[PDB]
Design a protein around this ligand. Sequence first.
Ligand SMILES: O=C(CSc1n[nH]c(-c2ccncc2)n1)c1cccs1
Lengths: 337, 18
Amino acid sequence: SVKEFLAKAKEDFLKKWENPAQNTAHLDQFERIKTLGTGSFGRVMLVKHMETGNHYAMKILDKQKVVKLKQIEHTLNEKRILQAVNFPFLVKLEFSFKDNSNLYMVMEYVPGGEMFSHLRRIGRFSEPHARFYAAQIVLTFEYLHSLDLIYRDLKPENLLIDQQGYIQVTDFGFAKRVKGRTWTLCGTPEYLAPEIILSKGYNKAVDWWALGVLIYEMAAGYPPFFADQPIQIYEKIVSGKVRFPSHFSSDLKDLLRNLLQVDLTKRFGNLKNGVNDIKNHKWFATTDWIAIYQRKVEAPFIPKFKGPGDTSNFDDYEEEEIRVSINEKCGKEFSEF
Amino acid sequence: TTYADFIASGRTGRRNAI
Ligand SMILES: O=C(CSc1n[nH]c(-c2ccncc2)n1)c1cccs1
């Protein structure tokens, strides 16, 4: 029944994947309100669709900055994957378009802010609070991996809490459709799997190690490997020595010792039972997977929203006038966008 | 504590991709 759902999901994905949606809006169809977030070659702005009065999060990428950072393929994969994906725990891409200067990805506005914001402020989540989110990530990856997609950027910053209190995974810049092994060094230092650092080839198992880093962070209030500088973080990851806070249940410690597993022949998600080694684990015993998927499970925290256009759950960022050059920039590089 | 070390660290802010 899960493999039945996933087979339907695949058919739906592959059609949108082999025939991507292009130019589904124009910049003048949207009223730019506030910067919700920031990235190296763009920003996510709170936007208002005038025809509908609907609120969206529009990701604006500078084509030249994408080209400069050799992020062409990454930007193309992200739009292609997002326009083809459909899962409850993934931000819905409503529109996508491009102009002379920028690439645009109009997404569903997730008003509750990032898990990062709430996790930092609250300190740590209770094991049931982290389990609830972990479960949503578990199914999300189960979904992405069935479509042969690697996420590669899981962290609290990328997971947005929606009005119902459910996660919505954003930032698809490192998402790649791979049937086999990949070698690109990408992701966030704290979440990198040893294979990525060791510059060896890697697969989906890196998303399971990331899930491990996320569950620890959510439960501890700090990542399992931190140091003031990235190369110092990498030394702790490759070492494969994790201390667990004294409050961690034996189940959590066991789940994490399997997810944060340097040995791929032993790493949960990377074995014969695949995802079921995670799903059935003692720490997830109380989890009803179908109920999580259907959003029928009670959220441990429902965000504060003071209207459809509210941005209070998001931090303030400096704004920059969106200038659209009179000449088409990097046109051929982004022709399929 | 491990928490104090994290709090005092330079990596308690929004982390960037590499
Ligand atoms: O702005 C961001 C990361 S912050 C973010 N991404 N997506 C969202 C968001 C917020 C609310 N609703 C949907 C998406 N916020 C960028 C990442 C890469 C280029 S720009």
